[PDB]
Amino acid sequence: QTDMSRKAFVFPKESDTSYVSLKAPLTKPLKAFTVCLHFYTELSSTRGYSIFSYATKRQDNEILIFWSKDIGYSFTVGGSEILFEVPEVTVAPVHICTSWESASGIVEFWVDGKPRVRKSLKKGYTVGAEASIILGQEQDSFGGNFEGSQSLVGDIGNVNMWDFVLSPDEINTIYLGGPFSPNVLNWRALKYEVQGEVFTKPQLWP
Amino acid sequence: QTDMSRKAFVFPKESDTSYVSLKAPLTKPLKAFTVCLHFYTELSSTRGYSIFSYATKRQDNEILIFWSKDIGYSFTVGGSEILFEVPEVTVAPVHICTSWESASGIVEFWVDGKPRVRKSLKKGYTVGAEASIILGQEQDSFGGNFEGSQSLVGDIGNVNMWDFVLSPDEINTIYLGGPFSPNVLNWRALKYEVQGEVFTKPQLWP
Amino acid sequence: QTDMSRKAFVFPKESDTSYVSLKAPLTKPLKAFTVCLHFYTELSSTRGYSIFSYATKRQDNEILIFWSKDIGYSFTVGGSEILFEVPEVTVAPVHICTSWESASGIVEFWVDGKPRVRKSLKKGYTVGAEASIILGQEQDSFGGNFEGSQSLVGDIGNVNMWDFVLSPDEINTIYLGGPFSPNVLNWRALKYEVQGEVFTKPQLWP
Amino acid sequence: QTDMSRKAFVFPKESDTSYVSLKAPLTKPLKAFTVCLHFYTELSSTRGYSIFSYATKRQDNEILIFWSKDIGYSFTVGGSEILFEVPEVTVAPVHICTSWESASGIVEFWVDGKPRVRKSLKKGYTVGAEASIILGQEQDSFGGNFEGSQSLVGDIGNVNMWDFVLSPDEINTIYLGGPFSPNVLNWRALKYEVQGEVFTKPQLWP
Amino acid sequence: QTDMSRKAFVFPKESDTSYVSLKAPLTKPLKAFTVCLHFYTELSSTRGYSIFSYATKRQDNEILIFWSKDIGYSFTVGGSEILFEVPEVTVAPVHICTSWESASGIVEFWVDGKPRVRKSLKKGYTVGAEASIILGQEQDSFGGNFEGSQSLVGDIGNVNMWDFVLSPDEINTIYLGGPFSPNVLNWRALKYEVQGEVFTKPQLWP
Amino acid sequence: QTDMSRKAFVFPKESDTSYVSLKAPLTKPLKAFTVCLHFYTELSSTRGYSIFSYATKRQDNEILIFWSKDIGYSFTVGGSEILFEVPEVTVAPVHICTSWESASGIVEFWVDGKPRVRKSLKKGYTVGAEASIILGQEQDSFGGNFEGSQSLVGDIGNVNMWDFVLSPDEINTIYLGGPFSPNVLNWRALKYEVQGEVFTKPQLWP
Amino acid sequence: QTDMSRKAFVFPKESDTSYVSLKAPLTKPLKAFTVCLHFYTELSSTRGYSIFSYATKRQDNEILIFWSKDIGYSFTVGGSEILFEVPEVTVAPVHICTSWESASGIVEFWVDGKPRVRKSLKKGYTVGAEASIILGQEQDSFGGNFEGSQSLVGDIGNVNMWDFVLSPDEINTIYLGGPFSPNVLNWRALKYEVQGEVFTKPQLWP
Amino acid sequence: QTDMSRKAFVFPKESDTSYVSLKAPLTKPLKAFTVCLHFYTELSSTRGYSIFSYATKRQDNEILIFWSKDIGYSFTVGGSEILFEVPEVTVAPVHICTSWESASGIVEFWVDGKPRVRKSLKKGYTVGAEASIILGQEQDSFGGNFEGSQSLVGDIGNVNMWDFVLSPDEINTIYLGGPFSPNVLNWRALKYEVQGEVFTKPQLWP
Amino acid sequence: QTDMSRKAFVFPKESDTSYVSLKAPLTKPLKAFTVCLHFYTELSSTRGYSIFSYATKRQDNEILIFWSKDIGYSFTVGGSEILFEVPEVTVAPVHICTSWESASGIVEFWVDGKPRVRKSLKKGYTVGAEASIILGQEQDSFGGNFEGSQSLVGDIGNVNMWDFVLSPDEINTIYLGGPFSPNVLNWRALKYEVQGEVFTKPQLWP
Ligand SMILES: [Ca+2]
Ligand SMILES: [Ca+2]
Ligand SMILES: [Ca+2]
Ligand SMILES: [Ca+2]
Ligand SMILES: [Ca+2]
Ligand SMILES: [Ca+2]
Ligand SMILES: [Ca+2]
Ligand SMILES: [Ca+2]
Ligand SMILES: [Ca+2]
Ligand SMILES: [Ca+2]
Ligand SMILES: [Ca+2]
Ligand SMILES: [Ca+2]
Ligand SMILES: [Ca+2]
Ligand SMILES: [Ca+2]
Ligand SMILES: [Ca+2]
Ligand SMILES: [Ca+2]
Ligand SMILES: [Ca+2]
Ligand SMILES: [Ca+2]
C-alpha cells in the first residue's frame, strides 16, 4: 500500500496525458458522498481546469468539481451543475470539501473551512459505484478523452472520499487536520497508478 | 417541543411552498419584543427575501424583517417601515437582533453584535398576540399567499423571541450564545410545523 | 443631581423641539476648558448636525462642535471656526474630546483617543460663564431658534466638561474609561432638563 | 470542539481531582507517534509529576511522560521506562517533543528544540488506539486512580500529537512556531473535558 | 495629581516614621487587581522589608508584597500567604507585577517581565475598597503600627494599580514601559502624601 | 539645559518668525551623524515644510530634512539632495531617523522604525560644526531668511542627534524608547531659544 | 573564509562596476540546487535588476534570478526562463528561496516563506560546476559585460546555496532563522571578492 | 555507492554486534590522513567508547579515535596513543576532525572547529592500506573481537576521510559545511555494510 | 591649564611621596558635589588604597573615596563613612561617579554606569571649599603625612568635579563620554602639580 501522507502529485505542465487514476474499494452505489482535497494552481485567472473527475460508464461527469474561469467552482453530479461564485481569488493553496446527500440533494461546499450556503442538486439521484476517478484531467469518456485546456497545472493532494455527508465538526477536523479515516478513498491507503509526467513531491501546504 | 440547538432549517430551493411555522404560547398582545436569529443566504446580492414574517388577520406585515435588494434591512411593525441601509453585504452567516418598544417606538437593530442607531417607529402601537410566524416566506394572508420571489433560500436558525427589550448586555450574551432564556419563542424548546422541502441540518455557523 | 452613568439621551427623530438642556454650576469665566462626549448618529450620510452647543447671551456659537457635511468637525469658539477635516466616517459611536486654551488659543481635537494636530483659535478670548448648554439642537438664541436641518438624531452621552485643558494622559483615561472628576459638567451628577421627545436608554457604545 | 490557541490549562493547586481529558478518536493502533507540549511548573525540585498520561484498559502507562525528581524525564511505553537524565532544570517554561517508532523502538526526546540522544524502547510493540489521555494527573487505571503526589501543578499547553515520527526539521518548525497539521491531537481543534479546578488562561510562554 | 514620571521616593535611612501614603479613588471592592512597581534595595541579603503594603480597616494585610529573608517574595491577600521562592538575589532594580483574580484565586507574580508559575490564593474573596496604601512601611493597623525592621530602605517607583488582571501581553508593555493606563493607582497622576524623611529623586533605573 | 521629556514644541499657525534654535555643543566637524525626531503636521498633503534645518555660514542647507509636496522626504547634505518618495502620506505622528556616513555616503532613512533602502549621498564630504540648528523653519541664511510657505505647522519633539551612524538595533530601541545617550543633541538636556509664537506642550504621540 | 552573519552587501549607487564575486569550489556538476537570499531594493517599480547571476563559460545565464519590471521574478536555468508573476510589489526586504531539480525540472520558488506553485524547467539539464557567481550585476560573459541598467541597487545578504532541493520544512527553518548547514555557498563561511563601490553594513532585516 | 547526505547511523543499544564496516577504495599506504565526523552520545561521562576504529591485518589500533572516560580523546596511530584532555564534556553533538602527517608526525585535533595544540605522534610511520574501517565498535582483530563495553551508543555520521592534511581553512568549511570532496572515504558516496541493530535516521545535528 | 584628555597619571611604584595635587577654582563651600574618575589598579585583592582624597585645614578626610580591602568602596564625608560592599572585585579599569547632597544627605554611588542604592550621609553638613585635592595618596594632614600602605598603584584619570548632583541621565553621558562641562574640576582644563614618580601616559581604558 502507498501512504501519501505529506505528499502531493505535481502536474507541472499543461498536457493531455499527465494524470493519476484512483481506485476506490466502492461497489455499492452512493446515496451520499463527501470528497475533500487540497490543490494549488496558478491557472484560476487564466483558464478553467478540472479539479476532480469521477466518471461512470453511463456518465463522464458523474462527479465533477470544476473551476470555471471568472466564475468559481462548478459542482456537478450526474451532469447537473451548480455554481459557488468566487469573486476574488488569491494565490494560496485552497482546501475544498464537497458533500452531496441524495435524499435531499443538499450540496455543502466548503472552502478553507468556510461553508457556502447549502444549494440543492439532483435529489433522489444515485451515483454509480463503477467509476474512473481521475486527477489532473477532465474526462469526457470513461477514463479518456482528456483536454489539455482542462488539465490541472500544479499540485493536488489529501484527496479523501467518504460515502456519507460529514458533519461540520468533522470537516473542521479535516481542515485543521485532526484524526479521521475515509472509507471510499483514503490518502493514507491510496490505490493509484500514475500516467504521463506526474511527480510525487512533499506537499507545500501544512 | 424540540430542542433545535445546533440545528438549522435549510430552504435549498426557491419555492412558494417551503416554510416552517412557529407556534407562540403567547397570551398578552406585545407592548415590546426582541427577536434574534441567524440566517445564511446568498440571495442578498440578487433579490429581497423575507427573513422573519409575523402576520395577523388585521395586518399581514405585523412584524417583517426584510432584506431589500441593494438597500439593506427593511424593518416593519404594523405595516410601517424603517430601513437599516447596508451598503455592502457579506456572504457570511449574519446574526441579527431587533427590539421594538411601544412606549417610545424606539427600534434597536443589531447586526453581528453591533448596534445600529436607534430609530423611532410606531409609538403606542400594540402587536397582536395571535400570529402566524413564518420562516422562509413572506406572507400576505394570515398564514399564506406566499411569493416565490420573496422566499428565503439557505439557512435560518437560533430563532428566539422575547416579549421585552433586552439590554445591550443580554444582546451581547445572545451573540455569544451565552446563558439566556427566551419566553415567547425558544429554539431550545421550539414548537413548529414544517411544510414543503425544508430540512433540519447541522448549522454552518458558531 | 442624577447619575447618568451607562445611560444615553436618545433623539430618535429629527425635530426642532427635542433638546436636553444641561445646567452647569459655573460662575467664573472660562479661560480654558475641555469637553468630552460619546455620540452615535448616521446623519453623517445625510446632513450636518450640532454635536454640542454652548450659547452665551451675547454669542450663540460660544462653543459649537458641529459636523459639517463633506468636511468633518467644525470647532468654533466665540463664533470663529476651524475644521478638522475627516476623510472617512463610519457607522460607529465616536468619542471626541476637544479642549481650548485662551492663553495660546491651542485647540486640541481628540477622536476616539487619537489626537488631531493642534490648531490655534481665538487666542486671548474669554468664554462667558452665563451660558445655555444644549444637546440635540444647534442654538441661535440663548435658548432657542433651533433648526431641524441641524438637530442631532441618535445618541449622545458621557457629556463631561472641565474648565481646564486635560493633558494627553488624562484624555486617555477618559477614553479607556478610567476615573476622572469633571469640574464643570459631570455625567455622573448631571443637572439637566429634557424637553420634547428625548429618551434615556442604555448606551450602545461600551 | 475548541480552538485553544494562545491558551493554557492552569492546575494551580496540588489535588487528585483536577484534570482535563483529551479525546482522540483513533481507529488504527499507533505504530509510531510524536507528542509535543509546553508545560510550566516549579515542582521539579520538590517531587515528580505526570506531564502526559496515555492509558489503555490493558496498560495504564501506555504512553507516559513523567518527571522523576532528581532524575529527569521518564519516558515509558507499554509500561517500560527510559530516563533522559537532566542534572538541573530551571524554573522556565519547557517545550518537549518526544517521538517513538515501533519499527525500531527508537525514542527521540527534544527539549526546547534540542534533541537528546536517540534511545531504544519497545521495538516491535504496538500502542492501543482506544485510550484515555489525561493532563494534570497520572493514571493507574483507565481514566482514573489519580494520585495527588503525581499531579502536575502549573501550566500545560500546545498539546499536539502525530501518529508518525516528525523529522528534525519538522520539530524545528513546531518549536519556532511555523504552521503544522497534527493528525492525532490538535490544540487548534482540541476536543476535551475539564474536571475539577482547572482554568483556561493566556499562555505565559511565547 | 502629580506626574511622578521618572521620579522615585527615596527612603535613604531606616526608620519607622518615614512613609508615603497613596490615595486610590477606589469605592467598588476589588474582585481582581494588578500591582506593578519598581524598587531598589540592599536589604534583601539582610532582613525582610515591605515592598507594597495595602490595608483595610478589617485587615491590615489586605494586600502585602513582602520580601522574606532567605525565602523571597511573600504575596498575601486577605491575610493569606504564598511564597515565590527566589533562590539567589542580586543587587539590581527589580520590576515586579502581581495579579490576583477572585474568580479563581490565581496569583501571577512577574519578576523583570518573567512569569512565575501561577499559584492559587483566596479564591472567592474580595478585597476591600476603602484602604490605606503605604510604601516604605508594613502597617499593622489601618495606617500605622509600623516596624523599623520591616520598613523598605531604598527606592520605590512606577507604582501602578489596575482593578483587573493584565494579560501577559499587557505586562510586557508594562515592563517595556509601553503605553498603559492604570485605572486604580496611576504614577503619572499620583495622589499621595509623604510623611517623614522621604525624598523625590530622579529614578536610577531606566 | 532643560529636560524636555514628554514635551513638544507646538507651531500652531503658519508664520516666518516662529522658530526654535537648538545649540549643539559640538566643536569637531561631523564625518557622520544620526538625527531622530518626532513630528506631527497636517501640511503633508498641502505643501512642503522644513522638518530639520541645519545650516552653516558656508551652506544654509547643510542638513535639510524636508517634506516635498507629493514627493516625500528630501534629505540633503552639503546642499546635495536625495529623495525617499512616500507615495501616500497619512495624518499620524511620524518618527524619522536619518543617518549619514562620510566614509561611504550611505544615507539610512528610517520611518516609524522601518528602514528605507540605503542610498548614497556626498561621499567624502565633511559637515561643519559651527551651525545654526532651527526647527520650524527652513533657513536660507545662517540663521534667517525663513519662508512662511516652508514653516512647520504642528508639533516637533524628541530631537536627538548623534555624531555617529547608529546600528539598526540602536535605532530600534530609539523607536521603542529604550535608554539612549545622544552625544550631540539631547532632548533630556536641550539648550534652546524660542522666538515668536511657539509653545511647549505635552507630546501628543505615545 | 569570512563570517558575514548579520552583515549585508550594500550597493548604494547604480554602476556597471560595483559587484561582489562569490567563490564556490563546487567540484561536481549540479543536478540540483537551492539558492536562498534576502534582498532590499526600491527599483522594483522602476526597472528590472539582477538578484543572483550564476554563469558558466558556456552559458552566461546558467542560473539567474531576475526581477523583470511590472512582471516579477524571472527564474532561468540554462537560458530557459519561467515567470512567477508578482502583480503588486511591497517595498520591504524580501526573502526568496529557489530550488531546481534536474530529474524532474520542478522549480520551487518561495517568497517570504510562502511557496509559489511548482513549475517545470529544463528537465534533464545539468548545471556546470566551473561557474562565476555575481551579486549586484547581470553578467553576459563568464565574468563581465555588466550593464548598469541591470545592476542591483540596494542590499543582498544571507546568500546560502545547497546542491540539493530543500524540503518545505527545511525552508521554513531557513526563513524562521533556525539552524542550517549550506553545502555549496555559506554566508557564515563566505569567500568573496568585492569590486568597485560595495560596502558591508549590518542587515536592515531580522 | 550511497549518498548518506543528512543521514546518520544510529546505535541505540549497547551491544558487541551492532556495527557498520566502511569500504574505502584505498589503493596506497597512507603518508597522511584527515578523518572528520559528527557523533552524539551520552556515554562520555559513563564509560569509554570507540568513535573511529581503523584496523589493518598487522595492527588492530592502526587508527583509533577513542573517548577514554575522564581523560578525553585518545588519538592513536599504530598503537601509540596521545591524549587530548577534555575536562568538561557536554550533551551536544561534537564534530571532530583529526589529521596526522608521517613527514612530521604532527597531529592536529579539531573539536567543533577549535584546534587543540598540535602534538607529535609516530613520525615516519606509514599506515597500511588494507584496512577494516569500523564504526560503532572497537576491534581487536581485523574486523572482529568487539567488546560491548567499548561500543558507541548513539549517532555517528558525516564520516569523511582524506589521504592528506586539510588546511585549517578547509577544516572550517567542513565544520560549517561548504563544498568539499574527500578522496578516501566520502559520505556523499559511501560504500558500507550494516551488521546487527543499526539504523539510518535523519541526522539530529544541523 | 592642561587638556589631559586621553591621558592618565601613572603611579607605577608604591611610595609615600608620589602624588599629583589638583587645584580647584572653588571658593563657595560645597552644599553638594559630584566626582567622577577612572582608575585601574591590581591592589584590590592586596590592600586598601586612596582613590580620591579631599582635605580641608580643619578636616583631612573631608571627602575620601577609599577602597577598603574585602569590603569595597569606603565613601566618607566629614569623617562620617558609608560602605558600598563589593562582593567580588574584577581586575579591569573601573569608572566611578559619586555624588553627595547636604540638603538630604543622600549619596549616589555609580560604578561602571550602574547605580548603587542611595544611602544617607552627613545631612546638613557643608564641605569646605578651601581644600587640598590629592590623587595617589591618602592625606592624614592638610597636604601631607601620606602612607605608602595607602598609596594608589596604577592609573587614575578623567577626574571631573561638579558642585552639584548630576542627574542619572547626566552620569550616563559621562560614562559614555558624551559632552559634559565640569564646574569645580575639569580634566579638559586641569590645574595640577606633580611630586615624585608620577607619569602622564596614554589612557589604557577606552
Ligand atoms: Ca467531461
Ligand atoms: Ca472536457
Ligand atoms: Ca405582506
Ligand atoms: Ca407579499
Ligand atoms: Ca448659530
Ligand atoms: Ca442654526
Ligand atoms: Ca500509572
Ligand atoms: Ca500512579
Ligand atoms: Ca501587617
Ligand atoms: Ca508588621
Ligand atoms: Ca527655502
Ligand atoms: Ca535653503
Ligand atoms: Ca546575461
Ligand atoms: Ca545582461
Ligand atoms: Ca583494539
Ligand atoms: Ca578493545
Ligand atoms: Ca586619613
Ligand atoms: Ca591615612
PDB file of C-alpha atoms in Angstrom, chain B residues 11-146:
ATOM      1  CA  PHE B  11     -34.567  26.075   2.428  1.00  0.00           C
ATOM      2  CA  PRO B  12     -32.475  24.878  -0.509  1.00  0.00           C
ATOM      3  CA  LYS B  13     -34.645  25.986  -3.460  1.00  0.00           C
ATOM      4  CA  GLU B  14     -36.703  28.986  -4.360  1.00  0.00           C
ATOM      5  CA  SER B  15     -40.308  27.959  -3.824  1.00  0.00           C
ATOM      6  CA  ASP B  16     -43.665  29.388  -2.794  1.00  0.00           C
ATOM      7  CA  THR B  17     -44.437  26.351  -0.592  1.00  0.00           C
ATOM      8  CA  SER B  18     -41.444  25.619   1.684  1.00  0.00           C
ATOM      9  CA  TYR B  19     -41.874  27.209   5.107  1.00  0.00           C
ATOM     10  CA  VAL B  20     -41.750  26.402   8.809  1.00  0.00           C
ATOM     11  CA  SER B  21     -44.474  27.809  11.053  1.00  0.00           C
ATOM     12  CA  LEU B  22     -43.587  28.595  14.676  1.00  0.00           C
ATOM     13  CA  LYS B  23     -46.249  28.462  17.402  1.00  0.00           C
ATOM     14  CA  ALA B  24     -46.100  31.048  20.201  1.00  0.00           C
ATOM     15  CA  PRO B  25     -47.633  30.207  23.600  1.00  0.00           C
ATOM     16  CA  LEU B  26     -48.277  33.934  23.812  1.00  0.00           C
ATOM     17  CA  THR B  27     -51.224  35.462  25.688  1.00  0.00           C
ATOM     18  CA  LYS B  28     -50.940  39.236  26.072  1.00  0.00           C
ATOM     19  CA  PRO B  29     -50.579  41.392  22.956  1.00  0.00           C
ATOM     20  CA  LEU B  30     -46.988  42.587  22.721  1.00  0.00           C
ATOM     21  CA  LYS B  31     -46.100  46.015  24.040  1.00  0.00           C
ATOM     22  CA  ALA B  32     -42.467  45.158  23.209  1.00  0.00           C
ATOM     23  CA  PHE B  33     -40.334  42.394  21.727  1.00  0.00           C
ATOM     24  CA  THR B  34     -36.831  41.240  20.881  1.00  0.00           C
ATOM     25  CA  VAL B  35     -36.296  38.739  18.048  1.00  0.00           C
ATOM     26  CA  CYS B  36     -32.823  37.280  17.411  1.00  0.00           C
ATOM     27  CA  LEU B  37     -31.829  34.832  14.691  1.00  0.00           C
ATOM     28  CA  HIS B  38     -29.043  33.539  12.497  1.00  0.00           C
ATOM     29  CA  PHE B  39     -29.551  33.217   8.778  1.00  0.00           C
ATOM     30  CA  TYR B  40     -27.208  32.449   5.902  1.00  0.00           C
ATOM     31  CA  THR B  41     -28.174  33.095   2.284  1.00  0.00           C
ATOM     32  CA  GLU B  42     -26.529  34.193  -0.964  1.00  0.00           C
ATOM     33  CA  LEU B  43     -29.650  35.965  -2.264  1.00  0.00           C
ATOM     34  CA  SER B  44     -28.542  39.265  -0.711  1.00  0.00           C
ATOM     35  CA  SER B  45     -26.766  40.116  -3.973  1.00  0.00           C
ATOM     36  CA  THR B  46     -29.782  39.094  -6.039  1.00  0.00           C
ATOM     37  CA  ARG B  47     -33.232  39.834  -4.609  1.00  0.00           C
ATOM     38  CA  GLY B  48     -35.154  40.690  -1.496  1.00  0.00           C
ATOM     39  CA  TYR B  49     -36.132  37.884   0.840  1.00  0.00           C
ATOM     40  CA  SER B  50     -38.276  37.579   3.958  1.00  0.00           C
ATOM     41  CA  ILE B  51     -36.155  36.771   6.994  1.00  0.00           C
ATOM     42  CA  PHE B  52     -38.949  36.772   9.601  1.00  0.00           C
ATOM     43  CA  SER B  53     -42.675  37.210   8.872  1.00  0.00           C
ATOM     44  CA  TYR B  54     -45.133  37.794  11.741  1.00  0.00           C
ATOM     45  CA  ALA B  55     -48.726  38.107  10.499  1.00  0.00           C
ATOM     46  CA  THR B  56     -52.159  38.754  11.995  1.00  0.00           C
ATOM     47  CA  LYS B  57     -55.575  38.909  10.350  1.00  0.00           C
ATOM     48  CA  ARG B  58     -55.765  42.698  10.578  1.00  0.00           C
ATOM     49  CA  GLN B  59     -52.172  43.100   9.381  1.00  0.00           C
ATOM     50  CA  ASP B  60     -50.065  40.675   7.342  1.00  0.00           C
ATOM     51  CA  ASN B  61     -46.757  42.508   7.941  1.00  0.00           C
ATOM     52  CA  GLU B  62     -47.241  42.883  11.672  1.00  0.00           C
ATOM     53  CA  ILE B  63     -43.532  42.270  12.023  1.00  0.00           C
ATOM     54  CA  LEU B  64     -41.372  41.884   8.920  1.00  0.00           C
ATOM     55  CA  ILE B  65     -37.599  41.750   8.869  1.00  0.00           C
ATOM     56  CA  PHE B  66     -36.982  42.016   5.119  1.00  0.00           C
ATOM     57  CA  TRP B  67     -33.829  42.205   3.056  1.00  0.00           C
ATOM     58  CA  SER B  68     -34.498  44.771   0.330  1.00  0.00           C
ATOM     59  CA  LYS B  69     -32.166  44.430  -2.631  1.00  0.00           C
ATOM     60  CA  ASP B  70     -29.249  46.884  -2.832  1.00  0.00           C
ATOM     61  CA  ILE B  71     -30.701  48.687   0.200  1.00  0.00           C
ATOM     62  CA  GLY B  72     -30.448  46.562   3.356  1.00  0.00           C
ATOM     63  CA  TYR B  73     -32.772  45.556   6.197  1.00  0.00           C
ATOM     64  CA  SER B  74     -36.298  46.770   5.976  1.00  0.00           C
ATOM     65  CA  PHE B  75     -37.845  46.557   9.448  1.00  0.00           C
ATOM     66  CA  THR B  76     -41.643  46.848   9.648  1.00  0.00           C
ATOM     67  CA  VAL B  77     -44.049  46.837  12.564  1.00  0.00           C
ATOM     68  CA  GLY B  78     -47.770  47.072  11.872  1.00  0.00           C
ATOM     69  CA  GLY B  79     -47.262  47.923   8.208  1.00  0.00           C
ATOM     70  CA  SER B  80     -44.865  50.840   8.815  1.00  0.00           C
ATOM     71  CA  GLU B  81     -41.286  50.540   7.584  1.00  0.00           C
ATOM     72  CA  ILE B  82     -37.832  51.796   8.503  1.00  0.00           C
ATOM     73  CA  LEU B  83     -34.556  50.929   6.811  1.00  0.00           C
ATOM     74  CA  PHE B  84     -31.167  49.971   8.226  1.00  0.00           C
ATOM     75  CA  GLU B  85     -29.375  50.515   4.924  1.00  0.00           C
ATOM     76  CA  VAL B  86     -26.394  48.184   4.463  1.00  0.00           C
ATOM     77  CA  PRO B  87     -24.139  49.413   1.634  1.00  0.00           C
ATOM     78  CA  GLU B  88     -22.308  46.096   1.186  1.00  0.00           C
ATOM     79  CA  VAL B  89     -23.455  42.694   2.433  1.00  0.00           C
ATOM     80  CA  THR B  90     -21.001  39.924   3.312  1.00  0.00           C
ATOM     81  CA  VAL B  91     -21.599  36.400   2.085  1.00  0.00           C
ATOM     82  CA  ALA B  92     -21.305  35.143   5.674  1.00  0.00           C
ATOM     83  CA  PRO B  93     -23.819  33.983   8.288  1.00  0.00           C
ATOM     84  CA  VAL B  94     -25.491  37.093   9.738  1.00  0.00           C
ATOM     85  CA  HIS B  95     -26.826  37.172  13.295  1.00  0.00           C
ATOM     86  CA  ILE B  96     -29.463  39.903  13.701  1.00  0.00           C
ATOM     87  CA  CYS B  97     -31.292  41.020  16.835  1.00  0.00           C
ATOM     88  CA  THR B  98     -34.153  43.510  16.576  1.00  0.00           C
ATOM     89  CA  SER B  99     -36.008  45.044  19.521  1.00  0.00           C
ATOM     90  CA  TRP B 100     -39.049  47.354  19.492  1.00  0.00           C
ATOM     91  CA  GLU B 101     -40.787  49.067  22.417  1.00  0.00           C
ATOM     92  CA  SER B 102     -44.255  50.593  22.155  1.00  0.00           C
ATOM     93  CA  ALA B 103     -43.818  53.176  24.905  1.00  0.00           C
ATOM     94  CA  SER B 104     -41.125  55.022  22.916  1.00  0.00           C
ATOM     95  CA  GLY B 105     -41.302  53.375  19.488  1.00  0.00           C
ATOM     96  CA  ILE B 106     -37.505  53.048  19.546  1.00  0.00           C
ATOM     97  CA  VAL B 107     -36.243  50.251  17.307  1.00  0.00           C
ATOM     98  CA  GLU B 108     -32.807  48.849  18.126  1.00  0.00           C
ATOM     99  CA  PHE B 109     -31.422  46.808  15.232  1.00  0.00           C
ATOM    100  CA  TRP B 110     -28.301  44.726  15.973  1.00  0.00           C
ATOM    101  CA  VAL B 111     -26.148  43.019  13.335  1.00  0.00           C
ATOM    102  CA  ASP B 112     -23.490  40.536  14.474  1.00  0.00           C
ATOM    103  CA  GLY B 113     -23.419  42.146  17.904  1.00  0.00           C
ATOM    104  CA  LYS B 114     -23.034  45.702  16.574  1.00  0.00           C
ATOM    105  CA  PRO B 115     -25.886  48.165  17.223  1.00  0.00           C
ATOM    106  CA  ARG B 116     -27.325  50.327  14.516  1.00  0.00           C
ATOM    107  CA  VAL B 117     -28.550  53.746  15.622  1.00  0.00           C
ATOM    108  CA  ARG B 118     -31.917  53.627  17.383  1.00  0.00           C
ATOM    109  CA  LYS B 119     -34.814  54.783  15.183  1.00  0.00           C
ATOM    110  CA  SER B 120     -38.433  55.644  16.037  1.00  0.00           C
ATOM    111  CA  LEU B 121     -41.292  53.507  14.738  1.00  0.00           C
ATOM    112  CA  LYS B 122     -44.998  53.207  15.615  1.00  0.00           C
ATOM    113  CA  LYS B 123     -45.031  54.630  19.115  1.00  0.00           C
ATOM    114  CA  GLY B 124     -48.126  53.475  21.001  1.00  0.00           C
ATOM    115  CA  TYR B 125     -48.903  50.541  18.697  1.00  0.00           C
ATOM    116  CA  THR B 126     -49.795  47.109  20.118  1.00  0.00           C
ATOM    117  CA  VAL B 127     -48.775  43.939  18.280  1.00  0.00           C
ATOM    118  CA  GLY B 128     -51.437  41.241  18.058  1.00  0.00           C
ATOM    119  CA  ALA B 129     -50.628  38.134  20.087  1.00  0.00           C
ATOM    120  CA  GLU B 130     -52.383  35.530  17.878  1.00  0.00           C
ATOM    121  CA  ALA B 131     -49.974  35.419  14.955  1.00  0.00           C
ATOM    122  CA  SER B 132     -48.662  33.278  12.114  1.00  0.00           C
ATOM    123  CA  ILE B 133     -44.857  33.294  12.459  1.00  0.00           C
ATOM    124  CA  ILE B 134     -43.480  32.151   9.083  1.00  0.00           C
ATOM    125  CA  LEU B 135     -39.837  31.353   8.338  1.00  0.00           C
ATOM    126  CA  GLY B 136     -38.870  31.015   4.687  1.00  0.00           C
ATOM    127  CA  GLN B 137     -41.740  33.006   3.192  1.00  0.00           C
ATOM    128  CA  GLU B 138     -43.227  36.440   3.225  1.00  0.00           C
ATOM    129  CA  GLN B 139     -46.943  36.107   3.907  1.00  0.00           C
ATOM    130  CA  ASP B 140     -49.894  38.251   2.851  1.00  0.00           C
ATOM    131  CA  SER B 141     -52.812  36.156   4.055  1.00  0.00           C
ATOM    132  CA  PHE B 142     -52.998  35.245   7.736  1.00  0.00           C
ATOM    133  CA  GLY B 143     -50.771  32.249   7.080  1.00  0.00           C
ATOM    134  CA  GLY B 144     -50.298  32.050   3.356  1.00  0.00           C
ATOM    135  CA  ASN B 145     -50.359  33.745  -0.020  1.00  0.00           C
ATOM    136  CA  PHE B 146     -46.582  33.382  -0.227  1.00  0.00           C
TER     137      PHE B 146
END
